[PDB]
Amino acid sequence: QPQFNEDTLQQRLQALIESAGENWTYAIFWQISHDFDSSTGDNTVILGWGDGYYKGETNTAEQEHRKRVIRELNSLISEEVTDTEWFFLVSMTQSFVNGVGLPGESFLNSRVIWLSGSGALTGSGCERAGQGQIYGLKTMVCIATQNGVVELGSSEVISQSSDLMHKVNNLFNFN
């Protein structure tokens, strides 16, 4: 009922994940920006990292690499790195042209895209769903809002519930 702003975004992501009855691993908010293209004159919507909330629940070379990257990130900013943690981390550098990829298709068409089960992810033909599935996710969800797209992921197979959709409706802006 009250139009939310960026200053409560982290709180609303936390509220979504901590209050949900199902075991969601994380939530991401993909925010809108625009990329003006000089060659066509088009102002295209681009979805990029807004914020996220990771709740949670690999070979040596991979672990050393991941731990190394965390160390380097710790440095700039100021033991095991799990697959879902890594997926969440890597997500921060992703962006999506409107209509393209899981968040882009959701936003273009103002859609709820609910992919539940490994086969739904790998059969979606959607690169981000495929990536989630490789990192152990079994449910991925994108819900378009007035300001972008809310994404949920889980390592469990989760069916769409009324209660989850009610919470999302109360925690983001809709037209």
Q: Which residues here bind another protein, judged by CB under 8 A?
A: 10, 31, 48-52, 54, 70, 73-74, 76-78, 85, 88-89, 92-93
Distance in angstroms (rounded) separating the CA atoms of residues 97 and 34: 9
For residue 123, CA distances in Å to 4, 154, 162 come to 35, 17, 25
In terms of CB distance, is 7 or 37 closer to another protein? 7
In terms of CB distance, is 30 or 124 closer to another protein? 30
3-state secondary structure of 97: strand
Supply the DSSP symbol for 124: S
Q: How far is the CB of 50 from another protein (least distance, A)?
A: 6
Angle, alpha carbons 7-8-10 (nearest 5°): 100
Q: How far is the CB of 71 from another protein (least distance, A)?
A: 10
Radius of gyration, alpha carbons of the chain: 17
What burial class does residue 156 get, using C-beta atoms within 10 Å of its C-beta: 0-12 exposed, 13-18 middle, 19+ buried?
middle
Q: How far is the CB of 169 from another protein (least distance, A)?
A: 24
Distance in angstroms (rounded) separating the CA atoms of residues 150 and 2: 18
In terms of CB distance, is 48 or 130 closer to another protein? 48
Q: How far is the CB of 42 from another protein (least distance, A)?
A: 22
In terms of CB distance, is 31 or 170 closer to another protein? 31
In terms of CB distance, is 38 or 71 closer to another protein? 71
Distance in angstroms (rounded) separating the CA atoms of residues 168 and 26: 14
Q: How far is the CB of 151 from another protein (least distance, A)?
A: 13
